[PDB]
Structure formats: structure tokens, C-alpha cells
Automatic annotation (TrEMBL):
Belongs to the 2S seed storage albumins family. It comes from Perymenium macrocephalum. It comes from the Eukaryota. This is Preproalbumin PawS1. Disulfide bonds join 3-14. The gene is PawS1.
Length: 17
């Protein structure tokens, strides 16, 4: 239940937690 920022695509990724 949390996400994080990233440079390469996808620019934004999330988690099932």
C-alpha cells in the first residue's frame, strides 16, 4: 500500500502492500 518516484518509465510505480 505504497508508491515511489522513479526516473525511467513508468515514472511512478506502486505496490500491492
Amino acid at each position: 500500500g505504497d508508491c515511489y518516484w522513479t526516473s525511467t518509465p513508468p515514472f511512478f510505480t506502486c505496490t500491492p502492500d
